[PDB]
């Protein structure tokens, strides 16, 4: 009974299942007969068999060694001759296909990747009307296929019908109708207003088949000599060849639905009846029949969703088309016998196409794996960009707006806040996609005024419900039966109206049917602003998993499903007992007697260097049931999502530490290990083979002390369990290199005498600056071990380092209601305000920011959490709760607080004059504050923006090759850019020497840099600058364009002419090295 | 053009990097050589005109790609970069390398709120300060507390001896610093302060200067610059010090 929310990851699984079941078989059957140019020897593919091979590596092994999770495809073949007999048949290997993980992702080159869904136009026919600057209403029609060339029809201001093929000039429709082989009698039988076409016939003249073909050739191919057979060939290759034109099932279905035809579903090419019906519809629309309508292109009934299987089919098509030409060329060129089918197939283009699609495409994306919510959200995204979609620069403005047809199908809140805002969306919670590519939503039917809540809800599409009166999900019923009230709001013909409770047709299932998963986890959301809801949804996906997570006291009811539908919770499948529990293994024995075993992940790494860990919940000998949780992941409590913690909060100002959205916290949050997280990083090294000689991984590192080799072992690899700081040696690598930078006399004398020594260089692997932690895993891969190393390499080493991080000053914290801040101070617990119980507070927030940001749901949440903690109740509330009353939330909170006060027996926990306020004392002096303040329990999170990954400084480093300016980037010791706005500010101030020193000495004056550095070191004055390098580069670039540009010196006296100055010459006899150095 | 402005680059292990000017120059040279060879052996004068046309098109593509006819396309369907594309637009030479630049002796970090400060003071973390003031510290280590040479001072700094902090505490006394926030809409977006060393990894800012910068303490970051010469220090002290900006120029 009732309604159960279905799986949230059904799109990807359904798409891949459809691909495997039908797409490959249908695709392999569209090119099976391959012929040579002249005669016999046809090649055939039996595509229905298509066997698959078991993968060689599992998911964990593939991720360990940076591999790919894939299978191999084998398809039987056959080569006949029919002239001398001797049929041949064997099995052909066509390539390898990546496999889908049961979580719905792909493993490519050791990385998790996702494929997003695309929103595109639907194939079919569309009509439009437009007005000129002088009136003169005009009509157009456009026919769009799944793949091929479009068709266009237009009406003129005089009453003439024109045809525009692809991108050619206008054409009379008579030539196109006659070239198809239609007489005037059959043309007049399909037009309902034949006197309208007479004008076109008269003003454009009559044509025969051959004359029409000649005219078609003339206009389509200007310059070439016309020919009847030629024009016939263009027509056939344009609109009738089933290799360059495709309608699709959806296209044929839409054409039949719109134009009212009954053509069979197996025809996927244009016919004459379709063109005649389109012209008839255009004519009838012009003459205002009243039963013909124009089309809206933003309507969700005219748009389609494309998923992974449909996108893979096209790449398979391109690869097979590329392979077929090679097959034919090899079949014709060779003139020998024993041409085996296995020797006629070159599976290079297919493999290349599949690899390019899965590795370097726009819709294949690096998956977001900060926490389970982000991973779940990434899989349900809809994108309007990509091949066949739109472009950021060429996108208009109607595509970034909200349409009335989006309700219940696309969330109107979750969207990016950057340059691509309004172009990427999220699927709604209750939405689903049918077998044509359109989105449906469910409703309940009503009869005479009673909601039938036990009658198998009806799924409807955007165009099906345009002619019915549909009510929202907040309509209140007496006993789940009759609709109360006398004026019910409804939607009719894409308009909000009101009607009596007897003309209603359907009702939505839930009040939260309009939003997405992330937005559905915010309680008391109807008391906030929409922008703050968007910010809260965005910030909920940036939380870090904690050491010991906690589920919220005040929830919404969707946490268990969100935790379950992402794939880290293990549940008992039978009704038995527990036989064996261990930190890495759980066994379940049922009542019958069979056993089930599970292994658990332990301290693994995610895409964003977070932690994935599983722990048991049950004990030995416990009695379990079906569906009970026995283990959980890193960011989940016992079956529920848990991202933050519940802490004590008061709303009042401190001594300036809450000034502008800053946060003051206590020291208990540090030494009690609250908000402490674990991070894991990976380092890699390889041993190549240079032309001079192979490099070696060894321990004998030239010119290094003994204290730098304590932790290495035999080979020269760090030991597991060691503590490393910056500069430590992880893997010792030495390169045999013969650099020539010394006088050859000593080298030749040593070579002749002998005494072979170390002529090598040291470039070993060291940990970067600002890193420390424990070594937890070392993996070594070599040859002679069945390992697939990159070409030109002999050994690969991987090291894993783990770290624990606590909260500190400069870290970002946030809640679920759009409130964010930065920690500015940590206080000892004897200095914080305390309660009449004597308990110090945990965090102090400024009230000034509550009414300015217009997010007052946090006060409701805190006041409910206070009572929840005092009662041990853990309430759950559904949004839009005012349909049962007028002050539902306030009354609920007040009742809970009064009940808690009565139960605990402490009269100070609730007050009647100030319902939400308590008295608070000062921990420094012991004096109470003037007025009571607001105290509660808040659910807070810690984000991934930590100050440890943001501090950077530079004095001198690398420079660019061309412009000789400092490099840019944190990862390569880069400098900060001084843009033109800062130059404007410095010019407005009047400081000229600062600007001049910034522009020349500190950026690219190759000689002045060293002079300045050495003058500073020696304590003398800084000499005057010269000319920057970029000006000389610009002068050379301008001269390369054959322009005579030069600098001149004015003539002081006499008739002597001005003299050209050589800028690229040395003035002073001093050295100019590439980088500043300390001389002596 | 000189060869050092179009470098070849020796990454890729065994292959080489791609530069677009070299391809156009090679095409021009190839067409010229073919035309000369054809002209030498007295070819029929219907094949020579073809080579002349292709040479003209190649030179046109080298000068300005896509100005007249079709555009030359590299490996992927991506047009090449000609000589006129280097000096043309927002990413050209003029607006990227001449009117703005990257600089040395600069830093960047997150900002927190510091009360109990003076309006002309700021708080600088020690990790940033030890890097931004290196030559002055080296000079003071050589002059006072006679060490020996530069190498010993660098070894002392790297080893993190406690003396370098005592030296740095008095190197920075009296030396102004410049602070900037990313959108500089008017001249009050850059200002000069006097630094004091703090423990941590965030910069402390006086609450009374926030509205001029348009900054709040919920995620913003700031950039720090250090003057070098005596004239620059005098200008920073007497023209841009944050305690002398009382009224609005607008």
């Amino acid at each position: 009974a009732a309604f159960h929310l279905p799986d949230l990851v059904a799109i990807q699984r359904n798409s891949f299942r459809w691909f495997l079941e039908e797409g490959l078989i249908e695709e392999l059957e569209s090119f099976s007969p391959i012929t040579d140019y002249t005669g016999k020897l046809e090649l055939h593919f039996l595509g229905k068999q298509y066997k698959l091979k078991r993968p060689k590596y599992d998911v964990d092994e593939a991720k360990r060694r940076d591999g790919t999770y894939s299978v191999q495809m084998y398809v039987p073949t056959r080569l006949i001759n029919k002239e001398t007999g001797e049929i041949k048949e064997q099995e052909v290997f066509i390539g390898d296909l990546p496999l889908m993980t049961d979580r719905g992702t792909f493993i490519i080159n050791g990385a998790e990747r996702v494929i997003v869904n695309q929103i595109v136009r639907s194939p079919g026919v569309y009509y439009k009307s437009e007005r000129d600057k002088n009136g003169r209403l005009t009509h157009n029609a456009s026919l769009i296929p799944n793949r091929g060339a479009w068709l266009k029809f237009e009406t003129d201001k005089n009453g003439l019908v024109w045809v525009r093929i692809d991108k050619t000039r206008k054409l009379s429709a008579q030539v196109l109708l006659k070239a198809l082989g239609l007489s005037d009698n059959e043309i007049y039988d399909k037009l309902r207003h034949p006197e309208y076409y007479q004008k076109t016939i008269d003003k454009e003249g009559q044509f025969s088949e051959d004359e029409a073909l000649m005219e078609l050739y003339r206009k389509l191919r200007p310059g070439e000599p016309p020919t009847v057979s030629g024009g016939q060939q263009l027509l056939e290759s344009r609109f009738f060849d089933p290799k360059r034109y495709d309608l699709g099932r959806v296209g044929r279905y839409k054409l039949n639905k719109k134009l009212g035809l009954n053509v069979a579903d197996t025809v996927r090419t244009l016919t004459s009846e379709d063109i005649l019906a389109a012209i008839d519809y255009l004519i009838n629309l012009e003459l205002d029949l009243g039963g013909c309508e124009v089309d809206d292109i933003d309507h969700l009934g005219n748009r389609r969703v494309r998923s992974v299987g449909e996108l893979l089919q096209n790449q398979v098509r391109v690869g097979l088309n590329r392979l077929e030409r090679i097959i034919r060329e090899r079949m014709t060129v060779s003139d020998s016998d024993s041409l085996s089918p296995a020797s006629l197939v070159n599976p290079k283009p297919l493999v290349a196409a599949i690899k390019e699609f899965f590795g370097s495409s726009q819709l294949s994306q690096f998956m977001d794996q900060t926490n389970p919510l982000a991973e779940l959200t990434h899989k349900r995204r809809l994108s309007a960009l990509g091949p066949g979609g739109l472009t950021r620069e060429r996108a208009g403005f109607a595509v970034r707006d909200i349409h009335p047809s989006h309700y219940g199908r696309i969330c109107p809140i979750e969207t990016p806040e950057g340059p691509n805002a309004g172009l990427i969306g999220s699927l709604a919670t209750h939405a689903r996609v049918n077998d044509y590519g359109f989105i449906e939503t469910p409703f309940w039917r009503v009869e005479e005024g009673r909601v039938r809540k036990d009658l198998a809800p009806v799924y409807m599409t955007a165009d099906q419900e345009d002619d019915l009166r549909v009510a929202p999900g907040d309509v209140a019923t007496d006993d789940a039966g009759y609709i109360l009230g006398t004026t019910i709001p409804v939607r009719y013909r894409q308009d909000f109206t009101t009607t009596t409770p007897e003309r209603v047709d359907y009702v939505a299932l839930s009040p939260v049917q309009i939003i997405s998963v992330a937005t559905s986890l915010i309680p008391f959301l109807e008391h906030d602003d929409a922008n703050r809801a968007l910010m809260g949804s965005n910030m909920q996906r940036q939380a870090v998993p904690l050491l010991r997570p906690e589920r919220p006291l005040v929830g919404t009811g969707l946490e268990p499903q969100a935790a379950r539908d992402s794939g880290m919770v293990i549940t008992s499948p039978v009704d038995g007992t527990i036989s064996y529990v261990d930190a890495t293994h759980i066994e379940v024995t049922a009542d019958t007697g069979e056993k089930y075993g599970y292994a658990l992940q332990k301290y693994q790494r995610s895409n964003q260097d977070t932690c994935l860990n599983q722990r048991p919940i049950v004990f030995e000998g416990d009695r379990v049931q079906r569906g009970q949780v026995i283990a959980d992941g890193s960011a989940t409590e016992k079956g529920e999502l848990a991202l933050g913690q519940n802490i004590l909060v008061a709303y009042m100002p401190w001594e300036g530490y809450n000034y502008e959205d800053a946060i003051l916290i206590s020291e208990r949050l540090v030494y009690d290990d609250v908000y402490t997280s674990i991070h894991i990083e990976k380092f890699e090294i390889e041993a190549r083979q240079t032309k001079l000689g192979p490099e070696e991984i060894t321990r004998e590192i030239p010119n290094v002390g003994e204290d730098a080799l304590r932790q290495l072992d035999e080979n020269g690899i760090i030991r597991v369990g060691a503590w490393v700081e910056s500069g430590d040696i992880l893997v010792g690598k030495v390169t045999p290199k013969g650099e020539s930078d010394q006088p050859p006399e000593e080298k030749l004398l040593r070579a002749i005498f002998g005494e072979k020594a170390r002529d090598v260089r040291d470039n070993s692997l060291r940990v970067p600056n600002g890193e420390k932690g424990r070594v937890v895993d070392v993996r070594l891969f070599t040859r002679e071990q069945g390992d697939e190393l990159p070409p030109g390499a002999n050994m690969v080493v991987r090291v894993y380092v783990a770290q624990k991080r606590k909260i500190q000053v400069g870290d970002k914290m946030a809640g679920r209601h759009g409130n964010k801040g930065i920690i500015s101070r940590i206080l000892p617990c004897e200095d914080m305000p305390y309660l009449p119980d004597g308990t110090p507070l945990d965090i102090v927030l400024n009230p000034l920011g509550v009414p300015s940001r217009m997010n007052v749901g946090q006060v409701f949440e805190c006041m409910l959490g206070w009572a929840g903690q005092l009662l041990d109740a853990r309430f759950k509330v559904t949004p839009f709760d005012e349909m049962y009353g007028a002050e539902a939330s306030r009354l609920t909170v007040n009742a809970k607080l009064s009940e808690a006060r009565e139960q605990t027996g402490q009269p100070w926990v609730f007050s009647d004059d100030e319902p939400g306020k308590i008295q608070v004392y000062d921990g420094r002096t012991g004096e109470p504050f003037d007025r009571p303040v607001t105290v509660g329990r808040a659910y807070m999170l810690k984000l991934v923006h930590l100050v440890d990954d943001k501090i950077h400084a530079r004095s001198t480093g690398p420079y660019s090759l061309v412009t000789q300016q400092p490099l840019g980037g944190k990862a390569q010791q880069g400098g900060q850019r001084f843009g033109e706005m800062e130059v404007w500010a410095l010019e407005a101030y009047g400081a000229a020497y600062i600007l001049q020193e910034l522009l020349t000495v500190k950026s690219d004056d190759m000689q002045g840099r060293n002079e300045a550095l050495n003058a500073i070191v020696k304590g003398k004055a800084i000499p005057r600058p010269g000319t920057p390098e970029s000006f000389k580069v610009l002068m050379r670039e301008l001269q390369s364009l054959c322009l005579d540009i030069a600098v001149y010196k004015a003539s002081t006296e006499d008739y002597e002419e001005d003299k050209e100055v050589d800028l690229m010459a040395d003035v002073n006899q001093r050295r100019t090295p590439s980088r500043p150095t300390y001389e002596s | 053009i000189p060869p050092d402005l179009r470098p070849m680059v020796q990454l890729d292990g065994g292959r080489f990097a791609t530069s677009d000017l070299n391809d156009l120059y090679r095409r021009v040279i190839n067409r010229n050589n073919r035309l000369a060879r054809l002209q030498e052996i007295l070819a029929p004068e219907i094949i020579v005109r073809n080579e002349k046309r292709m040479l003209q098109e190649a030179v046109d593509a080298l000068i300005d790609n896509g100005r007249r006819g079709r555009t030359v396309v590299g490996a992927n369907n991506r047009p090449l970069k000609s000589l006129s594309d280097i000096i043309e637009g927002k990413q050209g030479r003029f607006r990227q390398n001449l009117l703005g630049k990257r600089v040395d002796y600069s830093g960047r970090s997150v900002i927190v709120v510091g009360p109990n400060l003076k309006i002309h003071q700021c708080g600088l973390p020690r990790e940033m300060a030890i890097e931004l003031f290196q030559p002055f510290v080296i000079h003071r280590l050589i002059k006072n507390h006679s060490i020996n040479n530069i190498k010993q001072a660098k070894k002392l700094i790297q080893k993190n001896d406690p003396l370098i902090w005592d030296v740095l505490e008095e190197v920075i006394e009296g030396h102004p610093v410049m602070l900037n926030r990313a959108p500089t809409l008017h001249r009050l977006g850059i200002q000069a302060f006097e630094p004091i060393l703090v423990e941590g990894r965030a910069i402390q800012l006086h609450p009374l200067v926030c509205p001029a910068f348009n900054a709040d303490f919920d995620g913003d970051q700031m950039a720090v610059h250090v003057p070098l010469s005596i004239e620059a220090q005098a200008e920073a002290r007497m023209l841009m010090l944050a305690s002398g900006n009382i009224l609005s120029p607008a």
Binding site: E987, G990, Y993, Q996, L999, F1031 | L98
Partner: peptide, 16 residues
Amino acid sequence: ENVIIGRLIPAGTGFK
């Protein structure tokens, strides 16, 4: 123009 070639701007302290 003095910015592009790297000279003292004719305004402020670089007036003369």
